Design a protein around this ligand. Sequence first.
Ligand SMILES: Nc1ncnc2c1ncn2[C@@H]1O[C@H](COP(=O)(O)OP(=O)(O)O)[C@@H](O)[C@H]1O
Ligand SMILES: Nc1ncnc2c1ncn2[C@@H]1O[C@H](COP(=O)(O)OP(=O)(O)O)[C@@H](O)[C@H]1O
Ligand SMILES: Nc1ncnc2c1ncn2[C@@H]1O[C@H](COP(=O)(O)OP(=O)(O)O)[C@@H](O)[C@H]1O
Ligand SMILES: Nc1ncnc2c1ncn2[C@@H]1O[C@H](COP(=O)(O)OP(=O)(O)O)[C@@H](O)[C@H]1O
Lengths: 540, 525, 526, 104
Amino acid sequence: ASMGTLAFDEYGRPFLIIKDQDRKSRLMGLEALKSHIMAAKAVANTMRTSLGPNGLDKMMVDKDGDVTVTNDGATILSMMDVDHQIAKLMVELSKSQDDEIGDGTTGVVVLAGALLEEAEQLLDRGIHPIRIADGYEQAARVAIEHLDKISDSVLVDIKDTEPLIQTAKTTLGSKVVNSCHRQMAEIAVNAVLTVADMERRDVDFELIKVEGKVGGRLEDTKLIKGVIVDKDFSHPQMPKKVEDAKIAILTCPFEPPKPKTKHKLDVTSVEDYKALQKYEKEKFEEMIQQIKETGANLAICQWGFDDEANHLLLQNNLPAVRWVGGPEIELIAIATGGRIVPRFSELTAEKLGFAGLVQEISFGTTKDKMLVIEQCKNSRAVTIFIRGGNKMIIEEAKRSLHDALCVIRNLIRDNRVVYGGGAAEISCALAVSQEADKCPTLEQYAMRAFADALEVIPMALSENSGMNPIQTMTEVRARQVKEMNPALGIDCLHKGTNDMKQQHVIETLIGKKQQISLATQMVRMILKIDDIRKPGESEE
Amino acid sequence: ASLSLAPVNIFKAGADEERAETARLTSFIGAIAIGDLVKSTLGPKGMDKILLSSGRDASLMVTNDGATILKNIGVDNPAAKVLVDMSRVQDDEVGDGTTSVTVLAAELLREAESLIAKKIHPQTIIAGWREATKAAREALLSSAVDHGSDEVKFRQDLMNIAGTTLSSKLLTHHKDHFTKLAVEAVLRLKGSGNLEAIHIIKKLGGSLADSYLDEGFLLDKKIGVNQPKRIENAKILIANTGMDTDKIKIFGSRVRVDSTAKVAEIEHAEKEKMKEKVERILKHGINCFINRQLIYNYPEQLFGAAGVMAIEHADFAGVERLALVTGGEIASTFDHPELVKLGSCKLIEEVMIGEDKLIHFSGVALGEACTIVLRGATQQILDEAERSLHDALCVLAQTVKDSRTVYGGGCSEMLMAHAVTQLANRTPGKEAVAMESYAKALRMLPTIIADNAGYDSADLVAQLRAAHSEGNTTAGLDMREGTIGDMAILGITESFQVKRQVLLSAAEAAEVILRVDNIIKAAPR
Amino acid sequence: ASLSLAPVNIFKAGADEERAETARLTSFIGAIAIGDLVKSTLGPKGMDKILLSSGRDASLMVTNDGATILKNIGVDNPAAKVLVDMSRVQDDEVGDGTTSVTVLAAELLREAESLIAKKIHPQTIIAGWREATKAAREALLSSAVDHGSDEVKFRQDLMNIAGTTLSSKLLTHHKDHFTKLAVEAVLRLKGSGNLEAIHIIKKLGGSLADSYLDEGFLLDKKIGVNQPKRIENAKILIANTGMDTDKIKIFGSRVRVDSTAKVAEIEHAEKEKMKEKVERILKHGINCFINRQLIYNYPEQLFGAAGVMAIEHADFAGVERLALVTGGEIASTFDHPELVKLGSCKLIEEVMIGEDKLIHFSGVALGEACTIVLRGATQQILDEAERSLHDALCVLAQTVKDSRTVYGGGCSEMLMAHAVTQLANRTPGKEAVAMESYAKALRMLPTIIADNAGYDSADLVAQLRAAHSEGNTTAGLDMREGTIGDMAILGITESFQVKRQVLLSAAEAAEVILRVDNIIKAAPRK
Amino acid sequence: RGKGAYQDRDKPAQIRFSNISAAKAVADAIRTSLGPKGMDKMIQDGKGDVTITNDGATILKQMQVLHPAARMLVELSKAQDIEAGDGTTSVVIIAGSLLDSCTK
Ligand SMILES: Nc1ncnc2c1ncn2[C@@H]1O[C@H](COP(=O)(O)OP(=O)(O)O)[C@@H](O)[C@H]1O
Ligand SMILES: Nc1ncnc2c1ncn2[C@@H]1O[C@H](COP(=O)(O)OP(=O)(O)O)[C@@H](O)[C@H]1O
Ligand SMILES: Nc1ncnc2c1ncn2[C@@H]1O[C@H](COP(=O)(O)OP(=O)(O)O)[C@@H](O)[C@H]1O
Ligand SMILES: Nc1ncnc2c1ncn2[C@@H]1O[C@H](COP(=O)(O)OP(=O)(O)O)[C@@H](O)[C@H]1O
């Protein structure tokens, strides 16, 4: 199954089969499945180290030279130089788990890795993938039934968020931000409950942006219930602080609009030149009086203004900014309740949004300031401001708050939750062992394969930290036999107790069942695919 | 598993993965390489460095501050990029300690390499380092002292801090005089926290002692031809107009003529419009006029006939600081001569220093801008001196904002080291080992600070350790003879906020870099 | 004025000498390489190492002892050659601890370059290391114990020491049986250091537990055609006589005859002289004859007619040891039957083990020899077995010569650590820092000792530090549980002389290496 | 309690994996010729020497291999043949399977 097929016909003539067959490595069948499963092997073993609080963090340098240090596996593997389609399939698996739940994206990849780990030995024994897939699906059903059996739910609603705070702190423990877990949990829950819909509806994440600037200290990370504006005032003597400001939405430049179609105007005499000059001057006069008619405090210009308009605004002492991005205009209009204004024709004081407080923020000797908007009586947008010692700890904080808010959203979606940290994994392994002991023999190999696959999560958690894996495995399994509990698992933080519930660790049951189902389906699909085409010409 | 020893390499051309220990080896070796490239600028005996441009520009600069090296250097190690990012963050925070935080991070990473070679897990190291940083911060705030209420003590501490900043720079010859000059300059702002207002000039030749402070403003824009060369006690107005071939902004306008008579009529109309604009400008009651863009021959001739000076090529920063120092208001429409405030100045002159014509402002009204004269033989020493002066202004502003200060020069370093060592021997486990390595990096910082002078290290370090064990928390190393003594009486003090910021930044950078286990690479271009 | 930036230089084709700091770098990296290649074979969890020559020959070695590992290795760092030399010296002195002294020297040079980076001069380092070595020797002398006066106590100490020595080898499974065998062999030597009196066979097949110290011997020679295949209670005769293509040593005589009758008469003369020589051999009253050289058809036919066993191709060392253990003598003139000594034998037979025939010998007269049968699975496991047995015999012989003992396994190591720690704390200066780095390397040796099993390092270091603080000079690590214990009770005992020699040699080699500053290279020959 | 030994060094492990891989290459090159139902081996000499048989140890004597593990497997097979004389082909296969188990 290499460098083509050697036949050379059969009476001595030259023979041609496939184009570029001088070096084409033709890959079909069991060896092709070996190739795919071992590529997935490499992907899973390179990715799995980011599991658990003690789990380390991978870094990547993209094709553009930008670094990325990350703990959440979905974004760790989201920018990989995937070549074989199986890796891309795992990428869509991770994406589906991420936008379905947000957390546990590492779990599916490692689970599929271990599933294939024992699947490849089962294939080496000479077992065709169909029965392996059927046994794996039966095993997945058994695991889902166990997960449903060991469920436990609590209150999640907006009025009580102490369990939400504990869940967020547990989720962020795996991230480096675990220093001020209480502070980030409190600010994140305040941000998510600032604007939210409790009638099983989506929370507007378009209006909740996680943005911050480098500098200061990590504990300075604070919530700003408003809008962050990067731009600053153009004039030096122009005032920097305005309170109870009114937002004047402007979508036109402070210049006379020009005809869209190509046009020609003939100016021939002195009278024509002076007439054009006075027409243009009176157009500026009409525009500035129209602007001042509304009497708004803050005017936001998308297309900016020229020097004459700047001086006219300075004399009128009306604060205004220039060249603001469109999405920012939409955000500020929604937060302040403003209305769309095409030009001065529909410009009036009745279509102005309100900003509670507007300030300029300084961060020392930088000559680059910013505008903060908050205290809005009807603020529909809330943002969290994060401080850090460098831009990459800032990015890590961004993704950590993202994952925490995703976990909060999952909790809000449904209260059906379970206990993580390998305890539920160990219970699932026990259930799969029981099913293997109580179901026809031929597929029991796939049974115990799936069991050993589910057993990798405590494996990875232990070897990430450093404790002896298998003795803890056996001891916890024996204790779980003594008492049925999804809260008997690995003490990763070395707290001295295997009572996982006592350590306040909560994860959504929907997440775990979806993880198991997705992993089983992807593994079954990969088991049934044995076709990849390569030219393999070894170009120089 | 690892892709280093694998049946296949799932990569494109030039992309590779290496074993975990090899990956950390490469990353931390790049980090320590950039660290000791920025090294050797610590202490008053910090050796200078040339910032050469490898390209055809060949721009040669010299600086004693390592942050200048950091902002302009090629990046190879990703951890080096993280280090330059955090150092730039610290530099934007405060003007001093950037090289300090960088070298601390580099050490923390190199003893991190050594300790991982000593069979210790990164998470244990992180936990121990967090504990040690908490202990060091609590010790630093325990010994922190604030003396801003006492004006005489505040001024003396400003003297000490500016001298501390200038000691690392070559300006130590005039350190005291430049210190009092810079303190007067920062107090000239009447509590204003801005620093772009204080402006500096460069003049080739002359001794370094010739540098001084100008209370007014220094200007280097040429004066027109026909207008009179010197008129004093005038009103200065700032304009944002183009003031060159003013034409109708309408794009669709065009001229269609059948003869040159109408062409000449249009030319005369444009000249008359320009004359009307000139008269509108002159209606403001102005003699010294300031413009941003070019001024053509007809307006300058009209200004000369009017006996009114027009100054062009005044950039945004120049007009900004002129408005700050004189109260002038920028204008763009000249149809309201009395509706725009005009600048007020006492004395205006065009001094002749060197071989150039410089306009000098004296008796500024507002005074919210400082102009500093610096004299140097070469441009390199000139830019080094101005960078040192700017760093001094930054640290002085930081002290003004908060006067909580600590005794530096290895003294507070010994406080932190003693506290961390006490906690490390207090605590068991490998966390104690990791945080004792933290403490030894802390001790080795001032070790190399003093060794940059070619002095002894172990004896002074042990003596200061013993003295601070006795309770001499005010004892610090003296660079004058390479000896020990009371750190305060030496008049060398460091702001507590700067020390805390440096400590926190180094801790966070070490924590984030150390958590990296393996290096994965995409396809290079 | 150096060669860092010089317009002109003095060098040969390809020659480029290198400065002092980079000389230190290269020599110390070579020393680190040597230590790494010799380490990982320490403690009961030592890991074997393979050798593969860079050429096509690919010399393959399997052994748990680092001395043989460093014996066969290409050398480019002269400091590496120094390390190999000192390790070989330790091996020639005693059997065990050679890897210990080698790794001690390697880690000492590691800490030496660390101190160089710490901006200190080598001379102060050497002075501090001399002072610390003095203090460590004093501390070791403090807890030295000797029990050679009592025979039963001496045997118990031999049991413990040989068990500890063989624990680091692969034979730990049958350690007890191997230790009993070693004690039996050593006491059968009557305290003699004659290693050549000890031989161990490398035969293939069987299980290592079947090994035993047989009192007799084994002959690998072949029985003649007409000679009897079994002779009992014979007399051992050893000869240097060539008796093959026998000719006079005078090369100046040639045959220039005018008739073939002269040549035939000459040939009759040599055959008659052969008959006379055979008669001279037989008149001594012999039945088993041992020869170094080959035997032709006529002598073996005559011996088969005479019913006398003949043994050929027995080298000088083997026959000399046989004479030492039995009572025979090596001869060259057979006109003196009464002046040639013969041995006394009891059992000579053949044994078939697997598919190979071996002439078995038994019933020694003096018993001043040691032969052990080894049922090694492969050749390399055999080689490891003989290496471990030889090391055990050597350490037992050394303990016989000097019966002073100490308690090691990290316990003595932490004892030196504590002594040097107090010495450092009671003196100022960079000398104290240098000897503290010394002691840190000393403590880092048990790091490898325990990490050959994956055990904790710092916790055990602190535990042993506290135990020695209460004065427990017997508290050491146990690989079974990773905790403290009584090495006297636990049986981990080490010879005082061997350990003191290891420490002193490591200190001396480190001092020698640190005194070299610059290395200059001539033109390479390749 | 908590963490134990960090176990920083790892390269000799993967070197041992390479040795096991060579041992299994030899083993599954040898495996086929076992039993009456079995079929002779599949091994060609680099130099070009040829033998043809069904007893394993003869093939073990065929190979002129580089890795010492393969050489000592040959020693194991010939030792077993010397000792008993049967099951020599089984011994090599068992050894290779055990080596893969040690891998896992
Ligand atoms: N305190 C803890 N102790 C033990 N295990 C934990 C703890 N916190 C989280 N885990 C487990 O670590 C796993 C990884 O979680 P995390 O890295 O935060 O996100 P993801 O699940 O997306 O990888 C989770 O499945 C959880 O069960
Ligand atoms: N007189 C002095 N004695 C001892 N140390 C000093 C003295 N003056 C300055 N230093 C230290 O030398 C360091 C060098 O400062 P500098 O090179 O200006 O920037 P950075 O602090 O970023 O290195 C300062 O951080 C300061 O703590
Ligand atoms: N049971 C044991 N417990 C602790 N240490 C031991 C034990 N057995 C041997 N050792 C130590 O391991 C070291 C290695 O011994 P070995 O490999 O036989 O020779 P060498 O000392 O030359 O390496 C010895 O120096 C000995 O002190
Ligand atoms: N007639 C038979 N029926 C079933 N099995 C057999 C038969 N003959 C031999 N075997 C099996 O073949 C295996 C190997 O025997 P053999 O090939 O002769 O030894 P070796 O592998 O050393 O050459 C034995 O385990 C035996 O069980």
